[PDB]
Amino acid sequence: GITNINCSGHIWVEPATIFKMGMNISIYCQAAIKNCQPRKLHFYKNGIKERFQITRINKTTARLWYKNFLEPHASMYCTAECPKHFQETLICGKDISSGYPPDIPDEVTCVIYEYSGNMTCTWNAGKLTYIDTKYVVHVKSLETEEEQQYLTSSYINISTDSLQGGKKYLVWVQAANALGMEESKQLQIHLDDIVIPSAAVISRAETINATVPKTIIYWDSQTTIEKVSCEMRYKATTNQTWNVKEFDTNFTYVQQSEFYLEPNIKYVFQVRCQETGKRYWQPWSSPFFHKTP
Amino acid sequence: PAWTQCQQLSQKLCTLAWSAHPLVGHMDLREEGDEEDVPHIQCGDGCDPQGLRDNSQFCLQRIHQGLIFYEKLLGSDIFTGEPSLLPDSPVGQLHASLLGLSQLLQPSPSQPWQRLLLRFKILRSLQAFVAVAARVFAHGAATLSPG
Amino acid sequence: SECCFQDPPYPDASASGPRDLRCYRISSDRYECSWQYEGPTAGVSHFLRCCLSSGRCCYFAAGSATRLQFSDQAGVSVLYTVTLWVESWARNQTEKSPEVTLQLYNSVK
């Protein structure tokens, strides 16, 4: 009628309506008009009539062929010229998609930002998929052997409240789209070893005019974790090497690092911290510049 | 009076309707649904020049029903889903101009490829409706407005 | 042009005469017949004769022309085999072309 399409025939695609990008494809259109043997058969891509690579193989069926189809989406529909009509007769249409099968997800990592209360699991998804690819995250307890699954489109936050059965778990990721499906290797975690303390930030940078110029660096974090190791990098912007110092800091008070440096040069400063001995670190803080007197 | 605002906005509508879809008649395809529901300006709906001099209330009752009917479609998923219709696109302005003009009178599933063909069908059927609507407003502002 | 089914105005009977009769289908329902004549064309009248499947035979008065067209309702059948030849009456006796017989419909070229 007016609010719906009434197909008068059907259309199909080889190899399939969803195919690997860059492949040759053939689109077949078979008409089914009551009292009309079609004079000609047209194809439209995104409302644009196609003029090439169309062959009248059958009096009622037509084939459109594309070499190296690169569009990720395309709306196809075909029509028929009927002698008793001044209008083109709609046959049927179909949306075709192109993409790639998903890679085997690797670099699976699960961490718990301290006060976030939920565990953030990420991974490397691999090649571009272009098509709707869904990800299933499996979580299994090394103790009670019970397995939970979680669906997502990007990454996921899993609440620690749902992690009741033990503190040792196995985590792997399944990636799936129309063209394929792959699975990652199992990653085991210990909920005590995958915690990352709250962000550590640099406050100021003061230089003292005394015997030797001291560049005091003020930085602090709001973490309840006790055993914490940190690292700080400092380089002259003209230079291209990184100098680093290690500290086992106590965040009860704001930290003060005393550096003996050279005057009248630009500098850069970054910090990252971890629970001592644990596997994961913080990301490097945003670069903090400071010219000396 | 109020007839001038309805005349100016309807003038913009006929511009926006054809501007949204400049396809010619032979381009329009047809499908096996020959049999007939959609509100049309029927014969004797009081929208002829004599009908407005006798009583303009009858013609506006049908035009009001049509403007909210086609507005219901520009708000449907047909005109909002994939492929996305741009809001500032000339098709998007038609929606607000339809609701605004409708206010002055009296104070479902679909797949992305079907929407292209459906959108074509609605706009053409709308164009014939906006045409006769802009005629009664032009006649009203030129005859009943000065009085 | 319409095929008259009576007899030609000369007696039925030399080496000189027309030759190489070729007929094809020029349109969806119109046809054309071309031939050539060996000799002077002064006073020569050509007549294209055709015989149907029932045995009835007709003729076209071509006049001095060496090319004749006709529709599918002139009396000549096109879906079945017919017999064609050109007869020319210049002086003394009648002259004929080689015989050509075929189904006219499938002559599209």
Binding site: P83, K84, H85 | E35 | S28, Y105
Partner: protein
């Protein structure tokens, strides 16, 4: 496939056309109440094979068609005219009419309307002049059709093409109860039957009145100078054949300057200002203002 009656004692027989066809055997019956020695005579034909109340001849060529007559006892009882409808590989024959190519391919029937009044004129072309007969009937809608009265098909024009003459036929039609202001929902259906000698064909065309509207050229086109900058004020009027009133059936115009070599402006008003040049001509078209139908023809004046 089947056979059908065109009018009184006139029949059309559908024939698949391919080489070496068997045709379709046809059973004809004389309209006689009682007879035991019926002979059959086709028009002039002296040779008479007809016998009995029913005669069956294998229709496989035009020669088997025509007016078949059965007269008993030296008195003519009735006649019977047989026409052929040529079907070729599933395609109905279209030899009588010519392809107009407008607006698209295979547009044998083309129709125009000078206004919304409900009067329209459909025309066609043909390459023959004799033994030709047309028959036009029309209505609005197919299910419950409304009344549409059509005149007679008549020769309107005769021109020359490459090697032959082209013949233009036309017919005038009027909707019995027309509603110009109404938004049309059911289309007009025009059906034309064509018979050339013994060959029958039929054509069709569907349209709304609003889509076939082509107004007549502008009326009373004149020019007048402007002393300030030697510009010209063009003035025209609405055509008489256009619908009334003009405050309801508005129009839009297009004004251009052409000077025997190689300028278009659009307006809704009935005048405009342009610039004239040497041996230049100003021309104006017309179109419905609120519906993009066909443009009018040009009305021109010299500078």
């Amino acid at each position: 496939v089947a056979i059908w009656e065109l009018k009184k004692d006139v029949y059309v027989v559908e024939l698949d056309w391919y080489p070496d066809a068997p045709g379709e055997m046809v059973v004809l019956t004389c309209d006689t109440p009682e007879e035991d020695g019926i002979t059959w005579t086709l028009d002039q034909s002296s040779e008479v094979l007809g016998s009995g109340k029913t005669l069956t001849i294998q229709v496989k060529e035009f020669g088997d068609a025509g007016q078949y007559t059965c007269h008993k006892g030296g008195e003519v009882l009735s006649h019977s005219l047989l026409l052929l409808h040529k079907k070729e590989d599933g395609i109905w024959s279209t030899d009588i009419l010519k392809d107009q190519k407008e607006p698209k391919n295979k547009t044998f029937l083309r129709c125009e309307a000078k206004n919304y009044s409900g009067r329209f004129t459909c025309w066609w072309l043909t390459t023959i002049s004799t033994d030709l007969t047309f028959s036009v009937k029309s209505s609005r809608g197919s299910s419950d059709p409304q009344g549409v009265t059509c005149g007679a098909a008549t020769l309107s024009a005769e021109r020359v093409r490459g090697d032959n003459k082209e013949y233009e036929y036309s017919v005038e039609c009027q909707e019995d109860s027309a509603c110009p202001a109404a938004e049309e929902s059911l289309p007009i259906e025009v059906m034309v039957d064509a018979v050339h000698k013994l060959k029958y064909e039929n054509y069709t065309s569907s349209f709304f009145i609003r889509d076939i509207i082509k107004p007549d050229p502008p009326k009373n086109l004149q020019l007048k100078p402007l002393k300030n900058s030697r510009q010209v004020e063009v003035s025209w009027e609405y055509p008489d054949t256009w619908s009334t009133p003009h405050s309801y059936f508005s129009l839009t115009f297009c004004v251009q300057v052409q000077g025997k070599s190689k300028d278009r402006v659009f307006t809704d008003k009935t005048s405009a200002t342009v610039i004239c040049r040497k041996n230049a001509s100003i021309s104006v078209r017309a179109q419905d203002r609120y519906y993009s139908s066909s443009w009018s023809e040009w009305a021109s004046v010299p500078c």
